[PDB]
Structure formats: structure tokens, C-alpha cells
């Protein structure tokens, strides 16, 4: 009951896939937090480096994501996975080494020449971080989509359970890793942090390599695969155009459309929301409690998605999730026109034309945070159902290109969001931004609604079977 069953469970493809994904996410999040903190620190606190980093990441993701989706769709599986892993890990190690070495020779190198090498070093850091992010995106899409779909086989409940477990692991890692890495940073020296990051990434490289080989050996169905200067610049353009037009012509175009539209928002736990809360003076312990509540509601959303998909269906699950999120956003919107809200149209939203950076009632904030948390539960359910739809309804010979164009679209809608944060950074004009975000959410769900009407007709409200 314990000696044999546990040993059998710990030697299955599912568990090894879970372990590999958890290690990869842990390493990625730790690296991301370390890079953010270090770039905030060694360079003076300013929006220039942050804006450059965000813009570079977004644009690279769009273009090279279409390209790498095409590349993944035309090679073997073990080769692509191993390649992605090695590239990402080596990028991270080298980047961290260079970072620490500059942290060392900072003043001497600044005095050297006319300071023209600091810019080169920043360029190198940005480029290598971008390369690592691209490799991480590639490995994420290939592993999750292709390998999860193949391993799950023919059962549909297994696919749902696998997706839910992946989401839970992602949420727990996202909550936990930054806290631990910040603790180890503040309890020591930057040498401790950088050495820890590099060593952890190296060991993770080795272990994940072995785990991927073992999973490939265990499942024999992964080996088979159905379907198997002017020109050097023209070929990428042809692949880009073909991928985008193929994505546009898919019958599930509107679902991915709505999911992408759901990405531009300020109603999420993020640097902007935390800054607004600090402006309102909500301390740090309360912020930690709110993050814990957010994680709990995300887990609850995954559980609800599993139950609903088992009970009602796939499309109706998306409808229910959309309705829930919309109601919670309405609750959040109510907060703006309430006492204690610093909003007025008299002050122009645009104040930094060319400069930039280069008591009170408490009901409003409480209502806002309740709204965002319940929105989080609904959004997680909707994300899971759309992901399963995309996994289930795409030809194998094109699972890479379609998912890559999806990622590009998602990042685009992210980029626009960042832009508006630059345009209206005033704490007063925050409320208006909220409205815009809610509006966008509505549009997405409306668009998803049309998809439902194209696949269910007038029988839009019947969860059970006919009687």
C-alpha cells in the first residue's frame, strides 16, 4: 500500500514531467527577480533601462516567437528540447558572471575611456537576458503543448488534470521563489546571490537533461511524428507571413483572440498596483497577506475549472468563467466613484511631455482589492479552458506555429499596456486607467461569446443532458 504504490508512482512519465517543469520554473523565476533587482540597483533608479528591457523583450518575443514556433514545428522532439534547455542555462550563467564581474570593476571601468563601455556592458546584459527569455519561451511552448498532449494520450480528463497541476505549480513557484531569493540576498552579499543562481542553474541543467531523456525513453509514442542574402532574408519573411495567415484562418481564432485581449490590464498584482497601494499607505504585511489570498484564489480557480469541465462541458465553462470575472470587475469599478478616491479630470493626464525620469476613507482600496482577487479566480478558470481548447483543436503538423503566433499576440497586448503606464504615471489618474482595462476585458469576453454562438446555436443554456 505504501512500499510499492509510491515507488510505482514516482517512476511514471507524469511525475517526471511535473518535476522537470517545477525545476525549470523555479530557476527562471529566481533569475528574473535577480536581474530586476540588480538592474534597479547598480544603475540609478530610472525608467530608461526598464523601458528598454521591456520593449526589447516584447518585440523579440513577437518576431522571433513566430520564427521559433516554425522551427519547432519541423524537427525532432528530443533534439529541440535538449537544445532549448542548454541554450537557456548557458545564457543565464554567462550573463550572471558578467554582471558580478562588472559589479566588481565598476569605478575603475567607469573612469576608463569616456564611459563608453558602460553602455556596451548594459547592451550585452540586455541582449543575453533577451536570448535567455526567447529560449525559455521556446522550451515552454514545445514541452507543454506537444509533450503534454502526446503523454496524455486519448483521455481528456488526464489532460485537464495535467494542465491544472501545471498551473498550481506555476502559482506556488511564483509566490515562493522571490521571497526565498530575497531572503538569501539580504542575509549575505551579492556574491552569494550570483554564485547561488549560477550553481543552481547548472545543476538544474544536468538534472533536467537526464529527466527529459528518461521521459522520452519511457514513452515510445513520442518518437513518431506525422508529416515527416536576399533569400536568406526572404525566407524568414515568408515563414512569418504564412504563420500569421494560418493563425487567422483557424476555426478557433476568436477564442485565442479573446484570451490575448484579456492580457492588457492594471487590475493585477503587479509593480503598478503595489505602487498605488504604497501611495495609499497599506504597509507590507498586508501586501503579503493579499498575495497569499491571490494564490489561494488561483488554486481555487483551477479546481473549479476541473469540476466544471467534468460537469457541464468545455464551451459553457468558458462562459461561466467570463460571467464570474465580469461581475467581479463590476464590483471593482464601483470603487472609483466612491468617497476617498483621488480622481479628477481637471489635471491633464499627460504631464511629462519630454522629461519623464531621464485621514481618508479606506473603503475604496478594500473594494478594489476584493474585485481584483475574485477577478483572478475567474481569469484563471478562463485561461485553463482556452488552453485546453487550443490543445485539442489544432492539427499536429502545426501545433508549434499556431501556439507561437498565440504567444506573439499575447505579448503584443501586454506591450500596449506598458505604454499607457508610461503615458499616465500620476497616482491621481490611476482610476481612469482602471476603467479602460475593464473595458478591454469586456471586449474579449464578448468576442469569445461569438465563438460560442458559432458552435452551440440556440442551445446556449443547458449544462446537463436533455430530458
Amino acid at each position, epitope marked *: 500500500g505504501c512500499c510499492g504504490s509510491l515507488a510505482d508512482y514516482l517512476t511514471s512519465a507524469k511525475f517526471l514531467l511535473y518535476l522537470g517543469h517545477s525545476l525549470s520554473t523555479w530557476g527562471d523565476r529566481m533569475w528574473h527577480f535577480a536581474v530586476s533587482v540588480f538592474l534597479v540597483e547598480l544603475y540609478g533608479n530610472s525608467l530608461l533601462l526598464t523601458a528598454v528591457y521591456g520593449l526589447v523583450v516584447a518585440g523579440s518575443v513577437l518576431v522571433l516567437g513566430a520564427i521559433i514556433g516554425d522551427w519547432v514545428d519541423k524537427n525532432a522532439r528530443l533534439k529541440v528540447a535538449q537544445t532549448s534547455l542548454v541554450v537557456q542555462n548557458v545564457s543565464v550563467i554567462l550573463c550572471g558572471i558578467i554582471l558580478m564581474m562588472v559589479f566588481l570593476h565598476k569605478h575603475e571601468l567607469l573612469t576608463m575611456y569616456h564611459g563608453w563601455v558602460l553602455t556596451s556592458c548594459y547592451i550585452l546584459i540586455i541582449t543575453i537576458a533577451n536570448i535567455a527569455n526567447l529560449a525559455s519561451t521556446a522550451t515552454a511552448i514545445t514541452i507543454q503543448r506537444d509533450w503534454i498532449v502526446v503523454v496524455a494520450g*486519448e*483521455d*481528456r480528463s488526464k489532460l485537464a488534470n495535467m494542465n491544472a497541476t501545471i498551473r498550481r505549480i506555476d502559482q506556488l513557484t511564483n509566490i515562493l521563489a522571490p521571497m526565498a531569493v530575497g531572503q538569501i540576498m539580504t542575509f549575505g552579499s551579492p556574491v552569494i546571490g550570483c554564485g547561488f543562481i549560477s550553481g543552481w542553474n547548472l545543476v538544474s541543467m544536468c538534472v533536467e537533461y537526464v529527466l527529459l531523456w528518461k521521459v522520452y525513453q519511457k514513452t515510445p509514442a513520442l518518437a513518431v511524428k506525422a*508529416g515527416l542574402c536576399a533569400s536568406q532574408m526572404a525566407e524568414p519573411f515568408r515563414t512569418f507571413r504564412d504563420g500569421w495567415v*494560418s493563425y487567422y*484562418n*483557424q*476555426p*478557433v481564432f476568436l477564442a485565442g483572440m479573446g484570451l490575448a485581449f484579456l492580457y492588457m490590464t492594471v487590475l493585477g498584482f503587479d509593480c503598478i498596483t503595489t505602487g498605488y497601494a504604497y501611495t495609499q499607505g497599506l504597509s507590507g504585511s498586508i501586501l503579503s497577506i493579499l498575495m497569499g489570498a491571490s494564490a489561494i484564489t488561483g488554486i481555487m480557480g483551477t479546481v473549479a475549472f476541473t469540476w466544471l469541465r467534468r*460537469k*457541464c*462541458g*468545455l*464551451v459553457r465553462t468558458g462562459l461561466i468563467s467570463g460571467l464570474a470575472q465580469l461581475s467581479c470587475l463590476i464590483l471593482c469599478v464601483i470603487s472609483v466613484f466612491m468617497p476617498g478616491s483621488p480622481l479628477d479630470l481637471s489635471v491633464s493626464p499627460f504631464e511629462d511631455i519630454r522629461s519623464r525620469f531621464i485621514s481618508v476613507p479606506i473603503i475604496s482600496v478594500s473594494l478594489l482589492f476584493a474585485g481584483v482577487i475574485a477577478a483572478r479566480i475567474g481569469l484563471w478558470s478562463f485561461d485553463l479552458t482556452v488552453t485546453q*481548447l487550443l490543445q*485539442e*483543436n489544432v*492539427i499536429e*503538423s502545426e501545433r508549434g506555429i499556431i501556439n507561437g503566433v498565440q504567444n506573439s499576440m499575447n505579448y503584443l497586448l501586454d506591450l500596449l499596456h506598458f505604454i499607457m503606464v508610461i503615458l499616465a504615471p500620476n497616482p491621481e489618474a490611476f482610476g481612469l486607467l482602471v476603467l479602460i482595462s475593464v473595458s478591454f476585458v469586456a471586449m474579449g469576453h464578448i468576442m469569445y461569446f461569438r465563438f460560442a454562438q*458559432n*458552435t*452551440l*446555436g440556440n*442551445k446556449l443554456f*443547458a449544462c*446537463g*443532458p*436533455d430530458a
Partner: antibody
Amino acid sequence: EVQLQQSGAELVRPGALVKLSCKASGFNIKDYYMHWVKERPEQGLEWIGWIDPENGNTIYDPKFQGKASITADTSSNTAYLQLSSLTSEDTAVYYCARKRGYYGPYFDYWGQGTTLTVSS
Amino acid sequence: DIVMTQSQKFMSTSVGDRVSITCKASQNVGTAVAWYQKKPGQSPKLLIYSASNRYSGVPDRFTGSGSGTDFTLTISNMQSEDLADYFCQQYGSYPLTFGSGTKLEIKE
């Protein structure tokens, strides 16, 4: 080896009830959608509807909305099509087909077909 | 709903040459078209899916082409084992619809 079996050679009087069966061997119908298709003599193929055996949801064609019913049995791995108020214009050949998803590209496996005739 | 029509009904061919069957839709379906073959007294069998891809054990003399509203199935070097009916079916949106079909007859 995937196989679909249908009972056939049905002759009925007008205004009655007919039940046709499609039995699957080599796979579980719980993982697929089951579709029914009609073919009338010297006419084209017509789609009737589909069922999901996992939960029992059924989608029909507005032309057959009020005269056809589809049911499934997971334990016996069988699908059933029921027709009511038959008229002489219903004599045809009926096929049971398998589909993968909501927008599956193709019907990989079909049935042998069942001949239904309405006489007097 | 989308009405899917094939112009030619009877196509009289000869052994050894190449033939083309055209299918036209009333809306911009995209690339969601499949071609099936049916012999008399039998059940239809899959030939081409997504207008370009072949299905496993199918002779390489069948080719799918087209996009938008017009699609074409081409047979190179016809063989006596290819005198049957061919249907084009769309799956862009519900309800699903089929084509009328096409006959093949030899020359005399």
C-alpha cells in the same frame, strides 16, 4: 483494430418509432464525438447531429431538430439513434461516424451503413 | 449556412491521364475542406484533409490544392481502381455540409 458495427435492413410502416445502433470495438466512445449522417437515394450527404458520451450533450441540425434523438451507453460502448413520425420521404441509408474534437479535421472511421425503408 | 457546390456532375475521362475536380464555397471558409471517396455499395473513406495533407496509406497520385473559396482535387495517372464518387466537405462552422459529388466514366 477499430471497428464500427450497425444493425441493418429495417422496414417500417409510416408513423412509427425506429431505433438504430452503432457499436464500437477497439476503442472507448467516451473519448470521441459520435455523429450521425443520412444519405437519400440519388442525393447528397446530410449531417444529422452529434453526441458526447461523456456527459450526454447533443447538438442537432435545425432540419432534424424535432424528429431525431441521439443517446449513448458507455458501459456497453454503444450509440443509439431514434427516429419518430416516419414518412415515405425518410427511406435512406444511415451512417455512424467518429470525430476527435469540436472541429476535428476528418471522419477517420465510418460504419457499414443501415438501410431504412418505409412502406405500406 | 455555407452552401458547398460542385459544378461538374459527370466527368468522362480516359485511362492514364490526369483529372481535376473543383469545389467552390459561398463563404471564405479558409482551409477547412476535406475530400472523401466513396465506391458504390460501400462506405466513404478519407482521402485528403485540410485541403493539402494526405492521410497515411493513400497513393501519392492524389493532390489537394486551393484556398479561400475555390479548391481542387487533382489525380495524376488515373487507374481503373479510381472510378468512384468524390465529395468535398467543410468544417469551418456548424452545421456541417457536404458537396453534391462527381461521377467518373471512361472514354469510348
